[PDB]
Specification:
Two copies of one chain form a homodimer.
Chain A (H helix, E strand, L loop, with lengths): L9 E5 L3 H5 L7 E6 L2 E6 L6 E11 L2 E12 L4 E7 L8 H17 L3 E4 L1 H6 L2
Parallel strand pairs in A: 4-7
Antiparallel strand pairs in A: 1-4, 2-3, 3-6, 4-5, 5-6
Chain lengths: ~130, ~130
């Protein structure tokens, strides 16, 4: 991922399987914020659950370059929140991704959820 | 009918003046929820501000013992949030307070506010 000579290697790091990525999901009580070039969505009808954040993103060298998608999951595997780029694909940075994550986590914690993040998120996005 | 001695301590810490404790405020956009034996209030309108949490509470065994009141303040000194005991006054512990502070800070960060807590809260409460 950084041995190859003379060119930068891009990587797609994936916490979520294809199935998880394209799975369609629904929120009973949608809460949504636009945070710069990213969209944060949260189901407010989720409380006091253990939640994990999983993200699929593009890294260049050893820095997050592009968030493709992030979703929050219950232990049972259900999707309760999400961060994605705006439809216009505005271009965004690590700082943008970090802020959006802080917001999603904040929203979850206001509902008394216990939130953990994947190693990859911890390494590149948080 | 035994004699009762009353021995003063210095275990009661105060970040807020009695005035700040007494003051009366209103949320533009009020939200109020019960977290265990505690009531958390947060003005839903307040976003992207620098917010400081100040509290008045007793300590014991080097941890918060009982919360009298916690309030969140803008840099102007306007109140935007609060954690108080329920009027039942049902009794609570360090763990209850810590949970409620997590919730409040959570709601604040959902609204993109930057939160810091007083030294006392850092040391004893969160």
């Amino acid at each position: 991922h950084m041995t190859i000579a003379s060119v930068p290697t891009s990587r797609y790091l994936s916490d979520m399987t294809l199935e998880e990525m394209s799975r369609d999901w629904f929120m009973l009580m949608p809460r949504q914020k636009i945070i710069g070039p990213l969209c944060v969505r949260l189901d407010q009808a989720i409380m006091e659950k253990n939640i994990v954040l999983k993200a699929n993103f593009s890294v260049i060298f050893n820095r997050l370059e592009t968030l493709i998608l992030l979703r929050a999951f219950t232990e049972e595997g259900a999707i309760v929140g999400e961060i994605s780029p705006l439809p216009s694909l505005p271009g965004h940075t690590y700082e943008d991704v970090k802020n959006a994550v802080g917001v999603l986590i904040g929203g979850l914690e206001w509902n008394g959820n216990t939130v953990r993040v994947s190693e990859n998120i911890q390494r590149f996005a948080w």
